Design a protein around this nucleic acid. Structure first.
Length: 49
RNA sequence: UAUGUGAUGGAACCUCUCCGGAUAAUUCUAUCUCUUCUG
């Protein structure tokens, strides 16, 4: 659940980054909580579980 | 630099144990210095 470290061949150096899966999971969790608290209707955005 | 119908990692105290201690009167007398030229 943390950021990874890059390592290229040319210099054996890199920079940290965040994969999209972490953001996807966080958005899924937040949307689930929002839909639960809105009883499946948040400003006209009706949804199924 | 992921690959997608599924990530409680905020899901974990560098914590625990150990006398900066021990010994000492702010006291007091013998020289110092080497080359002199027949004596």
């Amino acid at each position: 659940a943390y950021a990874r470290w890059h390592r290229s061949l040319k210099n054996n150096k890199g920079r940290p980054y965040i994969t999209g899966t972490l953001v996807r999971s966080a958005i899924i969790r937040a949307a689930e909580e929002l839909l639960w608290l809105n009883d499946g209707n948040y400003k006209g955005a009706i949804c199924c579980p």
